[PDB]
Design a protein around this ligand. Structure first.
Ligand code: ADP
Ligand code: ADP
Ligand code: MG
Ligand code: MG
Length: 515
């Protein structure tokens, strides 16, 4: 194999092949972290001269090395400066330590297209313009970075993981704004871990596979549907590569309705006031042995609702009268345990750690066994997320509450967590409520849905748990995106704006198919 593009050093990480870039199209990239996705972006953006796994140190070398490839001309243009790709960086948290002043100052400066007013609208930046960069949240930094990139005038735009820190509405609206670039004839390359967003965004897909931290390989370009389906199946036909020993199928959105579950508990109208913000919860019922997905933009009260159910927060009005044990995986986790992951988890339930079912369905797929000897206080955000999810699912309780388990996880880890939640809840016949912004995770794990509506920071309303179709129709109408079903894998499939299916579904008010 002589498709070696870059080696980080002796025994360091090596990248094989590169994705294609095409004007007028969106090329999506999907794969586990540590496999070279950002490295390819750096190379194509001109930020890193690939050494071709040798000593190459010039663009001329790359130009000769890519003879016979459509990228030869690309690199010629890159070296000559006829193109200067715009890059929305992955590590938006580092923006402050390099930029100062008001957001409106950063954006006016990036504005080379006179679309400031439009981009601000799309990314909900109206109240961030006057804010200083130093006071921005990870979420606001992400949206400001996507806006800066969208405002530039160039031919090539590369977005590295734009959905991180964005709520469900924000990530789908940013995807619409990003895709518009290709409609204007520009070329877009986007790396994404949220499969629904990746789907809606892309015309072409590359799957990246390999061994995290050791090597990564870009697949041949694939049509959007075929690429995402091969990814779920764990097997790339043409390349004849099986990167996962099993398939992840989504077929199972119908049986989760034909079964009369008993009621676990009911809760009455609840109100939680935080100064000027107010959350009103409509009376609801929770069934034994079901999973309720919870969706809604942020700053609306999802976490506040979960906290009241977990008993960590008290309602201002209304009273919950339960005699249930609850296991709770909080949205923001702070490691504070002097001991290893194994010590922490073995103290929760050692019998489950030694259980074949738990090792197969939870510990191995989430990579927990490989973290057993790690000190909890030294875990990264993604490692801590997996360990906290496992810690929560290892507890013995009537109800399990998981507040945003997909944050910090890569696409493969998300699929592993979706399966773990579903399989363990089915096994233990218990109940869970899961707040999530990742549509395919919601789809995979949920039997019913609770939708939150309101004005972020001002007021929120928790609608009672309803069917998947009714809840997604309610949420999606607010965003103008429709999903149908893909028979091959059973996954929800995004319709491009204006397509035949999109028009048909919108006219009928059926924004989300299951059947
Ligand atoms: N500057 C560097 N020096 C050495 N190794 C690096 C450097 N940048 C990235 N790597 C390593 O290369 C691998 C792939 O990195 P990256 O392209 O950022 O992955 P991803 O698919 O998560 O975006 C990782 O194992 C990473 O630690
Ligand atoms: N303890 C608190 N004191 C004051 N305001 C709070 C408190 N907890 C949450 N809030 C505010 O309540 C609103 C709802 O927050 P939250 O429930 O975290 O939202 P989300 O839907 O993003 O999980 C936000 O505007 C938040 O700033
Ligand atoms: Mg990356
Ligand atoms: Mg929250």
């Amino acid at each position: 194999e002589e498709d070696c593009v870059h080696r980080y050093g002796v025994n360091a990480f090596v990248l094989y092949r590169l994705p294609v870039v095409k004007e007028g199209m969106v090329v999506g990239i999907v794969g586990p972290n540590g496999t070279g996705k950002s490295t390819a972006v750096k190379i194509l953006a001109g930020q890193l001269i690939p050494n071709l796994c040798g000593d190459n140190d010039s663009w001329d070398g790359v130009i000769r090395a890519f003879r016979g490839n459509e990228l030869q001309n690309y690199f010629e243009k890159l070296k000559n400066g006829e193109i200067r790709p715009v890059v929305k960086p992955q590590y938006v948290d580092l923006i402050p330590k390099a930029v100062k002043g008001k957001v409106i100052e950063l954006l006016k400066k990036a504005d080379e297209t006179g679309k400031l007013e439009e981009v601000v609208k799309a990314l909900e930046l109206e109240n961030v313009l006057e804010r200083e960069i130093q006071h921005l949240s990870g979420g606001e930094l992400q949206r400001v970075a996507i806006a800066a990139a969208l405002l530039r005038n160039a031919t090539f735009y590369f977005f590295d993981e734009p959905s991180s820190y964005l709520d469900i509405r924000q990530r789908l609206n940013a995807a619409r704004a990003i895709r518009r670039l290709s409609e204007e004839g520009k070329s877009v390359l986007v790396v994404e871990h949220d499969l629904a967003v990746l789907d809606y965004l892309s015309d072409i897909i590359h799957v990246v596979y390999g061994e995290p931290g050791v090597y990564g390989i870009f697949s041949q370009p694939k049509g959007t549907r075929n690429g995402i389906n091969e990814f779920l199946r764990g097997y790339l036909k043409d390349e004849n590569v099986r990167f996962r020993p099993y398939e992840i199928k989504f077929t199972k959105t119908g049986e989760r309705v034909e079964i009369e579950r008993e009621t676990l508990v009911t809760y009455p109208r609840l109100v939680k006031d935080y100064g000027s913000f107010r959350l009103e919860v409509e009376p609801g019922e929770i069934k034994k042995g079901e999973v309720i997905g919870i969706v809604g933009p942020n700053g609306i009260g999802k976490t506040t609702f979960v906290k009241m159910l977990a008993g960590v927060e008290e309602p201002t009005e209304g009273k919950i009268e339960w005699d249930l044990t609850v296991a709770y995986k909080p949205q923001y986790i702070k490691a504070d345990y002097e001991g290893t992951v194994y010590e922490l988890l073995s103290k929760i339930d050692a019998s489950k750690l030694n259980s074949n079912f738990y090792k197969t369905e939870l510990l191995k797929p989430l990579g927990i066994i490989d973290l057993y000897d790690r000190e909890v206080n030294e875990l990264s955000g993604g490692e801590l997320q997996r360990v906290a999810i496992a810690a929560t699912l290892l507890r013995d309780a009537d109800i399990y509450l998981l507040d945003e388990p997909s944050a910090y996880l890569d696409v493969e880890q998300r699929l592993a967590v979706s399966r773990a939640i579903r399989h363990l809840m089915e096994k233990n016949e218990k109940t869970a409520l899961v707040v999530e912004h990742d549509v395919l995770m919601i789809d995979y794990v949920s039997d019913r849905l609770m939708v939150f509506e309101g004005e972020p920071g001002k007021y929120g309303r928790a609608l009672p748990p309803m069917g998947m179709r009714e809840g997604m129709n309610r949420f999606l109408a607010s965003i103008g995106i429709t999903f149908r079903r893909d028979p091959d894998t059973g996954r929800p499939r995004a319709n491009k704006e204006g397509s035949v299916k999109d028009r048909e579904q919108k006219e009928k008010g059926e924004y989300y198919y299951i059947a």
